[PDB]
Design goal:
Elements lengths: L14 E10 L11 E9 L2 E5 L11 E3 L5 E4 L14 E5 L4 E5 L3 H15 L8 E2 L23 E2 L9
Antiparallel strand pairs: 1-2, 1-7, 2-3, 3-4, 5-6, 6-7, 8-9
The chain binds zinc ion.
Protein name: Tyrosine-protein kinase Tec
Subcellular location: Cytoplasm; Cell membrane; Cytoplasm, Cytoskeleton
Family: Belongs to the protein kinase superfamily. Tyr protein kinase family. TEC subfamily.
Length: 164
Amino acid sequence: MGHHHHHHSHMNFNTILEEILIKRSQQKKKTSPLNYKERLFVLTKSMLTYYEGRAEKKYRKGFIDVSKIKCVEIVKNDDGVIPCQNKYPFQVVHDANTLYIFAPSPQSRDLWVKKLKEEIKNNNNIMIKYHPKFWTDGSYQCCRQTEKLAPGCEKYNLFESSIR
Ligand SMILES: [Zn+2]
């Protein structure tokens, strides 16, 4: 059972950047681990949207608006080892929670963090501070305030001079 097609061309508009990225889903007291889910992510000026044409589960096709984003940075990892197969993760704080996305390469991470900052620079939703560590629910991260969206423990340079 469970064998038929359901493909329709729901194409996104003018893309800035697309890549096969890993979404670490933030679990909370339910039947979910810290799932590393490698999907196709496309960034547009209106929305960051991922792709999962699952021919098995009615899996959650979520999306983030650029205006929902409050902070984008690289994840300066406090741990020894990066858990996922992909390494050099970046973080996207938004209306709900702080999302964590592992890039295949530090090349991918660099360009993604960059382009996201270049979009969210015009938002009035941006916290002047961000969280450097892994915001996992009720865990011992940077400020140990991981419950609800704290306004950042380290200072966020929205316009950071990468210039050498
Ligand atoms: Zn913190």
